């Protein structure tokens, strides 16, 4: 069996290997990459997403989110407080201001220590799930605005057309901005390109051990757990690597830098934080291997779910028994 220890694997495709997205995802899985839940892909030197990032300051962040934490340093939740709209130029200035700028640090490890020591005592501002793309039209390889849609994948695999579209999202980050433990909607894959700026550190649990994380989360957030059988779908809960290790949860970590892709795999729980001002782009996608995960994916019905885009048709076709009551929610 490939990658039995579920290590995060890093791939360096040639320009020839970078032409067929589906084929390369399949290749990575043939080497066991999905067992980790997360893989890094470094594009060939000949490739670029766009020519320059000099003209992005006028993008609007319509609803910046101030991430206020409650709890303890290693076990906390965050609430996303809506702020006034601002441009990316204004956001970048704010991220670099004395209140929000990255502190001095020796290396990624030192910054990671500072993050988990001090995160809860600050409330950074985050731009999330902004429909849009920064890939040049003329970028033909791994352009997250030109992948095959999930609706087309479901039709190809299962035979029925469904409504819906599948478009990419932009994310604007600063130091300590945080993404809570989650899998993707309907346990889809995701792919994330870091366009510009400072790194993003990721934590991931192997899909085969995902239920171990869920059990710990129920123990650590018992009120939330009584309110919803799938409360990690709310995307507000954080657990530190130290607490995961204390509780024997298998996980791995890796830092993504500008110009690098990360792929998350079906039912791979992940969480992480940004090191400083950056801009990323991401989209969910599917493969034939996703179908059985979509059939089994947990759903939140309590009204608290954070869902990036409409999964109704996926639930309707893949989970007909659930459809009705999931829809009541």
Ligand X SMILES: [NH3+]NC(=O)[C@H](NC(=O)CCCCc1ccccc1)c1nn[nH]n1
- Residues at the binding site are 126, 182, 184, 192, 200, 228, 234-235, 270, 300, 302
Contact pick of 235, 251, 287, 311 for ligand X (by CB under 6 A): 235
228 is an interface residue for Zn ion by CB under 5 A: yes
Partner from Ni ion, Zn ion, Cl ion, none binding residue 118, C-beta < 5-8 Å depending on class: Cl ion
Tell me which residue of 112, 133, 85, 131 sits closest to 274, measured CA to CA. 112
Q: Which stretch binds Zn ion (CB under 5 A): 61-69, 94-102, 103-111, 226-234?
A: 226-234
Q: Which stretch binds ligand X (CB under 6 A): 1-9, 47-55, 148-156, 177-185?
A: 177-185
Contact pick of 61, 128, 174, 228 for ligand X (by CB under 6 A): 128
88 is an interface residue for Zn ion by CB under 5 A: no
Q: Which stretch binds ligand X (CB under 6 A): 36-44, 100-108, 182-190, 319-327?
A: 182-190
Contact pick of 133, 190, 201, 225 for ligand X (by CB under 6 A): 190
* Residue 56 near residue 279, CB atoms below 8 Å: yes
In the complex, the smallest distance separating the C-beta of residue 207 from ligand X, rounded to whole angstroms, is 15
In the complex with Ni ion, the residue whose CB is nearer, 202 or 277, is 202
In the complex, the smallest distance separating the C-beta of residue 264 from Ni ion, rounded to whole angstroms, is 6
Partner from Cl ion, Ni ion, ligand X, none binding residue 235, C-beta < 5-8 Å depending on class: ligand X
Compute CA distances 178 → 35, 123, 182, 301, whole Å: 24, 10, 12, 24
192 is an interface residue for ligand X by CB under 6 A: yes
Q: What secondary structure, in 3-state letters, does the chain show?
A: CCCCCCCCEEECCCCCHHHCHHHHHHHHHHCCHHHHCEEEECCCCCCCCCCCCCCCCCCEECCCEEEEEEEECCEEEEEEEECCCEEHHHHHHHHCCCCCCCCCCCCHHHHHHHHHHHHHHCCCEEEEEEECCCCCCCCCCCCCCCCCCHHHHHHHHHCCCCCCCCCCEEEEECCCCEEEEECCHHHCEEEEEEEEECCEEEEECCHHHHHHHHHHHHHHCHHHHHHCCCHHHHCCEEECHHHHHHCCCCCEEEEECCCCEEEECCCCCEEEEECCCEEEEEEEECCHHHHHHHHHCCCCCCCCCCCCCCCHHHHHHHCHHHHHHHHHC
Contact pick of 129, 136, 155, 304 for Zn ion (by CB under 5 A): 304
Q: Which stretch binds ligand X (CB under 6 A): 18-26, 45-53, 95-103, 184-192?
A: 184-192
Joined tokens for residue 180:
């809570």
In the complex, the smallest distance separating the C-beta of residue 68 from Cl ion, rounded to whole angstroms, is 16
* Residue 207 near residue 36, CB atoms below 8 Å: no
105 is an interface residue for Cl ion by CB under 5 A: no
In the complex with ligand X, the residue whose CB is nearer, 48 or 82, is 82
Partner from Ni ion, Zn ion, Cl ion, none binding residue 114, C-beta < 5-8 Å depending on class: Cl ion
Number of residues binding to Cl ion, judged by CB under 5 A: 3
Question: Where does this chain bind Zn ion (CB under 5 A)?
Answer: 228, 300, 302, 304
Question: Where does this chain bind ligand X (CB under 6 A)?
Answer: 65, 80, 128, 171, 179, 182, 184, 190, 192, 235-236, 280, 282, 306
Question: Where does this chain bind Cl ion (CB under 5 A)?
Answer: 103, 114, 118
């Amino acid at each position: 069996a490939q990658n039995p220890n579920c290590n995060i694997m890093i791939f360096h495709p040639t320009k020839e290997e970078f032409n067929d997205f589906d084929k390369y995802i399949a290749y990575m899985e043939s080497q066991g990459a999905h067992r980790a839940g997360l893989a890094k892909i470094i594009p060939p030197k000949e490739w670029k997403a766009r020519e320059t990032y000099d003209n992005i300051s006028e993008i609007l962040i319509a609803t910046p989110l101030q991430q206020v934490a409650s709890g303890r340093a290693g076990v906390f939740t965050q609430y996303h407080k809506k702020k006034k709209a601002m441009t990316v130029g204004e956001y970048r200035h704010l991220a670099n201001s004395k209140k929000y700028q990255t502190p001095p640090h020796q290396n990624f490890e030192d910054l990671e220590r500072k993050y988990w020591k001090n995160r809860i005592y600050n409330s950074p501002i985050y731009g999330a799930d902004i429909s849009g793309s920064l890939f040049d039209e003329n970028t033909k390889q791994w352009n997250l605005g030109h992948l095959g849609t999930i609706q087309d994948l479901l039709e190809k695999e299962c035979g029925v057309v469904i409504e819906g579209v599948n478009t990419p999202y932009l994310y604007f980050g600063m130091w300590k901005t945080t993404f809570a433990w989650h899998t993707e909607d309907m346990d889809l894959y995701s792919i994330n390109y870091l366009h510009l700026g400072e790194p993003k550190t990721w934590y991931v649990v192997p899909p085969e051990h995902g239920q171990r994380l869920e059990r710990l989360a129920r123990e650590l957030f018992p009120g939330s757990s009584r309110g919803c059988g799938a409360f990690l779908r709310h995307k507000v809960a954080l657990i530190s690597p130290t607490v995961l290790k204390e509780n024997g949860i298998p996980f791995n970590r890796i830092t993504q830098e500008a110009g690098e892709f990360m792929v998350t795999f079906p039912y791979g729980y992940h969480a992480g934080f940004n090191h400083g001002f950056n801009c990323a782009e991401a989209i969910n996608f599917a493969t034939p291997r996703w179908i059985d995960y979509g059939k089994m994916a947990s759903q939140c019905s309590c009204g608290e779910a954070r869902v990036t885009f409409s999964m109704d048709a996926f639930v309707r076709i893949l989970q007909p028994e659930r459809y009705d009551l999931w829809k009541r929610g």
